[PDB]
Amino acid sequence: GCPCIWPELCPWIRSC
């Protein structure tokens, strides 16, 4: 899954 806890703060992550 996305490594970033908050996907809203990690837009550069396709997972998020």
What residue type is assigned to position 13 of the chain?
Answer: I
Q: How was this structure determined?
A: NMR
Angle value at C-alpha 14, between 1 and 6, nearest 5 degrees: 65
Q: Strand, coil or helix: what is 4?
A: coil
The residue count for the chain: 16
Residue 3 and residue 9: Cα distance in Å, rounded? 11
